[PDB]
Amino acid sequence: MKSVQTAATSWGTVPSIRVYTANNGKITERCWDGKGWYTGAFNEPGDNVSVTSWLVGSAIHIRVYASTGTTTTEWCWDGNGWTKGAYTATN
Amino acid sequence: MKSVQTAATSWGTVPSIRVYTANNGKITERCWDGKGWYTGAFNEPGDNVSVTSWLVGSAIHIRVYASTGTTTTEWCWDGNGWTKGAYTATN
Amino acid sequence: MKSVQTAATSWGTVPSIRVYTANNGKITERCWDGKGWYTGAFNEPGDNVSVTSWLVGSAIHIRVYASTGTTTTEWCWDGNGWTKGAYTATN
Ligand SMILES: OC[C@@]1(O)OC[C@@H](O)[C@@H](O)[C@@H]1O
Ligand SMILES: OC[C@@]1(O)OC[C@@H](O)[C@@H](O)[C@@H]1O
Ligand SMILES: OC[C@@]1(O)OC[C@@H](O)[C@@H](O)[C@@H]1O
Ligand SMILES: OC[C@@]1(O)OC[C@@H](O)[C@@H](O)[C@@H]1O
Ligand SMILES: OC[C@@]1(O)OC[C@@H](O)[C@@H](O)[C@@H]1O
Ligand SMILES: OC[C@@]1(O)OC[C@@H](O)[C@@H](O)[C@@H]1O
């Protein structure tokens, strides 16, 4: 057994918070935006996770780097669902 | 034996930096703000750590997600000491 | 065998993205800035990695915290190559 691994990001004034947790090979997402926490749409395989986000005006963009073994898959939020990104690692 | 795990955040112009380190089940905090590094008030159990921070005007708010096993505790800095937050994980 | 560990940061409008990956004791860096991913100059030992970045005007500053065992080395980007920073951990 082992500890889960998390990554977090935030934006805005309230603020909006996203916390990604890698738990036994699966990454899920929890969301805060002023009231209580709730579960987000992100759900992808991964043993390790990192995240970064940026704003274009008021629109949030999120990149989640999910790693299983030596394979890191980037997942992209740009307002309309999660999609796989072009990220590949060195060599 | 194993490697420590860290998380970092920063704000401002100098800037101010916070680095959280999980070392053998305990998370401590180091701080930079223009001169040298010094130890911060955050000290809580955890094998894994992540962090995010945001500003309201000039006031910094920090959220540290500390995980021991499958249990993740959120710790909140809002100007006046660290307090436990409402975060819980999916299901 | 084990999974790689990553950290990510971003800045700007395009945006610019940096992803650091600790893979079998070595951390390398991948970069995005509007077209495709390419390999960055950062290459240092480490089993765990975290990152934070900030802007001074339009100039990016990056701090990468590389941990091997209980030893965490800070690496600094301030526009002109990576250099070791003053970071040390508690006690
Ligand atoms: O409001 C929740 C949500 O839509 O915010 C953007 C992303 O975090 C999504 O995965 C998530 O479902
Ligand atoms: O819109 C998707 C995308 O282009 O966004 C910027 C980078 O995250 C890329 O890897 C990714 O494919
Ligand atoms: O100046 C250090 C400090 O007060 O900054 C806010 C938090 O990082 C605290 O834990 C820490 O003691
Ligand atoms: O002020 C504390 C709090 O409400 O801040 C926003 C979120 O981090 C919540 O989980 C947390 O309880
Ligand atoms: O454009 C790539 C680059 O110069 O950007 C700043 C740092 O990420 C460097 O390691 C990297 O080579
Ligand atoms: O310019 C280097 C430096 O002073 O930048 C701020 C902190 O990251 C310090 O540890 C580091 O030595």
Side-chain angles (χ1 to χ4, degrees), chain A residues 32-45:
Chain A
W32 199 86
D33 193 35
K35 282 327 289 213
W37 289 87
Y38 58 93
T39 295
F42 185 83
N43 188 312
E44 301 295 346

PDB file of all heavy atoms in Angstrom, chain A residues 32-45:
ATOM      1  N   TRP A  32     -13.875  23.062  -6.366  1.00  0.00           N
ATOM      2  CA  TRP A  32     -14.483  24.003  -5.431  1.00  0.00           C
ATOM      3  C   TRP A  32     -14.757  25.321  -6.127  1.00  0.00           C
ATOM      4  O   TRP A  32     -13.947  25.789  -6.923  1.00  0.00           O
ATOM      5  CB  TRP A  32     -13.602  24.193  -4.178  1.00  0.00           C
ATOM      6  CG  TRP A  32     -14.345  24.766  -3.030  1.00  0.00           C
ATOM      7  CD1 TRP A  32     -15.081  24.094  -2.080  1.00  0.00           C
ATOM      8  CD2 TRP A  32     -14.391  26.135  -2.680  1.00  0.00           C
ATOM      9  NE1 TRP A  32     -15.631  24.988  -1.187  1.00  0.00           N
ATOM     10  CE2 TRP A  32     -15.202  26.251  -1.533  1.00  0.00           C
ATOM     11  CE3 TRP A  32     -13.824  27.287  -3.235  1.00  0.00           C
ATOM     12  CZ2 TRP A  32     -15.464  27.480  -0.924  1.00  0.00           C
ATOM     13  CZ3 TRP A  32     -14.075  28.487  -2.646  1.00  0.00           C
ATOM     14  CH2 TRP A  32     -14.888  28.584  -1.482  1.00  0.00           C
ATOM     15  N   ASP A  33     -15.929  25.909  -5.863  1.00  0.00           N
ATOM     16  CA  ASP A  33     -16.187  27.214  -6.454  1.00  0.00           C
ATOM     17  C   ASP A  33     -17.139  28.033  -5.592  1.00  0.00           C
ATOM     18  O   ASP A  33     -18.026  28.726  -6.105  1.00  0.00           O
ATOM     19  CB  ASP A  33     -16.723  27.101  -7.882  1.00  0.00           C
ATOM     20  CG  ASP A  33     -16.692  28.421  -8.575  1.00  0.00           C
ATOM     21  OD1 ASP A  33     -15.736  29.170  -8.282  1.00  0.00           O
ATOM     22  OD2 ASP A  33     -17.596  28.739  -9.353  1.00  0.00           O
ATOM     23  N   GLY A  34     -16.940  27.999  -4.279  1.00  0.00           N
ATOM     24  CA  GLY A  34     -17.605  28.916  -3.374  1.00  0.00           C
ATOM     25  C   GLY A  34     -18.523  28.266  -2.374  1.00  0.00           C
ATOM     26  O   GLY A  34     -18.869  28.896  -1.367  1.00  0.00           O
ATOM     27  N   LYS A  35     -18.939  27.027  -2.606  1.00  0.00           N
ATOM     28  CA  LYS A  35     -19.934  26.422  -1.747  1.00  0.00           C
ATOM     29  C   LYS A  35     -19.288  25.170  -1.183  1.00  0.00           C
ATOM     30  O   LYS A  35     -18.561  25.246  -0.179  1.00  0.00           O
ATOM     31  CB  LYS A  35     -21.236  26.173  -2.515  1.00  0.00           C
ATOM     32  CG  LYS A  35     -22.069  27.445  -2.690  1.00  0.00           C
ATOM     33  CD  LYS A  35     -21.975  28.458  -1.512  1.00  0.00           C
ATOM     34  CE  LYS A  35     -22.666  28.022  -0.235  1.00  0.00           C
ATOM     35  NZ  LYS A  35     -23.225  29.210   0.505  1.00  0.00           N
ATOM     36  N   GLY A  36     -19.489  24.009  -1.810  1.00  0.00           N
ATOM     37  CA  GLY A  36     -18.863  22.785  -1.382  1.00  0.00           C
ATOM     38  C   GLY A  36     -18.050  22.163  -2.505  1.00  0.00           C
ATOM     39  O   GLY A  36     -18.048  22.625  -3.653  1.00  0.00           O
ATOM     40  N   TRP A  37     -17.360  21.095  -2.156  1.00  0.00           N
ATOM     41  CA  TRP A  37     -16.586  20.388  -3.159  1.00  0.00           C
ATOM     42  C   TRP A  37     -17.480  19.441  -3.929  1.00  0.00           C
ATOM     43  O   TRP A  37     -18.407  18.833  -3.375  1.00  0.00           O
ATOM     44  CB  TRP A  37     -15.444  19.598  -2.509  1.00  0.00           C
ATOM     45  CG  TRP A  37     -14.348  20.473  -1.969  1.00  0.00           C
ATOM     46  CD1 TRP A  37     -14.285  21.056  -0.744  1.00  0.00           C
ATOM     47  CD2 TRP A  37     -13.154  20.851  -2.664  1.00  0.00           C
ATOM     48  NE1 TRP A  37     -13.124  21.792  -0.622  1.00  0.00           N
ATOM     49  CE2 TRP A  37     -12.420  21.699  -1.806  1.00  0.00           C
ATOM     50  CE3 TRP A  37     -12.663  20.590  -3.949  1.00  0.00           C
ATOM     51  CZ2 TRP A  37     -11.192  22.247  -2.170  1.00  0.00           C
ATOM     52  CZ3 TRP A  37     -11.462  21.128  -4.310  1.00  0.00           C
ATOM     53  CH2 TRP A  37     -10.735  21.961  -3.446  1.00  0.00           C
ATOM     54  N   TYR A  38     -17.180  19.294  -5.212  1.00  0.00           N
ATOM     55  CA  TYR A  38     -17.929  18.348  -6.024  1.00  0.00           C
ATOM     56  C   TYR A  38     -16.995  17.690  -7.038  1.00  0.00           C
ATOM     57  O   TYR A  38     -15.883  18.160  -7.300  1.00  0.00           O
ATOM     58  CB  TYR A  38     -19.098  19.053  -6.709  1.00  0.00           C
ATOM     59  CG  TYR A  38     -18.689  20.215  -7.598  1.00  0.00           C
ATOM     60  CD1 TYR A  38     -18.470  20.021  -8.965  1.00  0.00           C
ATOM     61  CD2 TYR A  38     -18.554  21.520  -7.083  1.00  0.00           C
ATOM     62  CE1 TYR A  38     -18.133  21.070  -9.789  1.00  0.00           C
ATOM     63  CE2 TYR A  38     -18.204  22.593  -7.924  1.00  0.00           C
ATOM     64  CZ  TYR A  38     -18.005  22.347  -9.271  1.00  0.00           C
ATOM     65  OH  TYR A  38     -17.659  23.362 -10.123  1.00  0.00           O
ATOM     66  N   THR A  39     -17.459  16.601  -7.643  1.00  0.00           N
ATOM     67  CA  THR A  39     -16.575  15.812  -8.495  1.00  0.00           C
ATOM     68  C   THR A  39     -16.610  16.366  -9.914  1.00  0.00           C
ATOM     69  O   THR A  39     -17.664  16.759 -10.422  1.00  0.00           O
ATOM     70  CB  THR A  39     -16.989  14.343  -8.416  1.00  0.00           C
ATOM     71  OG1 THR A  39     -16.769  13.872  -7.069  1.00  0.00           O
ATOM     72  CG2 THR A  39     -16.247  13.470  -9.408  1.00  0.00           C
ATOM     73  N   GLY A  40     -15.434  16.478 -10.526  1.00  0.00           N
ATOM     74  CA  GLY A  40     -15.328  17.001 -11.866  1.00  0.00           C
ATOM     75  C   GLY A  40     -15.323  15.917 -12.924  1.00  0.00           C
ATOM     76  O   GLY A  40     -15.318  14.718 -12.650  1.00  0.00           O
ATOM     77  N   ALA A  41     -15.310  16.371 -14.180  1.00  0.00           N
ATOM     78  CA  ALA A  41     -15.420  15.455 -15.312  1.00  0.00           C
ATOM     79  C   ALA A  41     -14.129  14.691 -15.575  1.00  0.00           C
ATOM     80  O   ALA A  41     -14.174  13.639 -16.229  1.00  0.00           O
ATOM     81  CB  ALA A  41     -15.791  16.229 -16.588  1.00  0.00           C
ATOM     82  N   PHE A  42     -12.978  15.186 -15.094  1.00  0.00           N
ATOM     83  CA  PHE A  42     -11.716  14.532 -15.428  1.00  0.00           C
ATOM     84  C   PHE A  42     -11.617  13.158 -14.764  1.00  0.00           C
ATOM     85  O   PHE A  42     -11.688  13.039 -13.534  1.00  0.00           O
ATOM     86  CB  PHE A  42     -10.514  15.398 -15.030  1.00  0.00           C
ATOM     87  CG  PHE A  42      -9.208  14.804 -15.460  1.00  0.00           C
ATOM     88  CD1 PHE A  42      -8.760  14.990 -16.754  1.00  0.00           C
ATOM     89  CD2 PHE A  42      -8.474  14.009 -14.611  1.00  0.00           C
ATOM     90  CE1 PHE A  42      -7.561  14.425 -17.168  1.00  0.00           C
ATOM     91  CE2 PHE A  42      -7.281  13.439 -15.014  1.00  0.00           C
ATOM     92  CZ  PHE A  42      -6.820  13.666 -16.289  1.00  0.00           C
ATOM     93  N   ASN A  43     -11.371  12.127 -15.579  1.00  0.00           N
ATOM     94  CA  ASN A  43     -11.209  10.780 -15.045  1.00  0.00           C
ATOM     95  C   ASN A  43     -10.378  10.008 -16.065  1.00  0.00           C
ATOM     96  O   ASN A  43     -10.896   9.632 -17.121  1.00  0.00           O
ATOM     97  CB  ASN A  43     -12.581  10.157 -14.807  1.00  0.00           C
ATOM     98  CG  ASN A  43     -12.515   8.835 -14.089  1.00  0.00           C
ATOM     99  OD1 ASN A  43     -11.734   7.948 -14.455  1.00  0.00           O
ATOM    100  ND2 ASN A  43     -13.340   8.690 -13.046  1.00  0.00           N
ATOM    101  N   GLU A  44      -9.101   9.804 -15.761  1.00  0.00           N
ATOM    102  CA  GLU A  44      -8.169   9.164 -16.676  1.00  0.00           C
ATOM    103  C   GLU A  44      -7.161   8.334 -15.894  1.00  0.00           C
ATOM    104  O   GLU A  44      -6.859   8.632 -14.732  1.00  0.00           O
ATOM    105  CB  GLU A  44      -7.431  10.199 -17.552  1.00  0.00           C
ATOM    106  CG  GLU A  44      -8.351  11.072 -18.401  1.00  0.00           C
ATOM    107  CD  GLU A  44      -9.127  10.323 -19.464  1.00  0.00           C
ATOM    108  OE1 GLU A  44      -8.788   9.156 -19.756  1.00  0.00           O
ATOM    109  OE2 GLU A  44     -10.092  10.907 -20.011  1.00  0.00           O
ATOM    110  N   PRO A  45      -6.570   7.320 -16.528  1.00  0.00           N
ATOM    111  CA  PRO A  45      -5.552   6.522 -15.835  1.00  0.00           C
ATOM    112  C   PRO A  45      -4.313   7.341 -15.509  1.00  0.00           C
ATOM    113  O   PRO A  45      -3.898   8.215 -16.274  1.00  0.00           O
ATOM    114  CB  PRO A  45      -5.214   5.420 -16.851  1.00  0.00           C
ATOM    115  CG  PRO A  45      -6.330   5.417 -17.815  1.00  0.00           C
ATOM    116  CD  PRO A  45      -6.820   6.824 -17.889  1.00  0.00           C
TER     117      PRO A  45
END
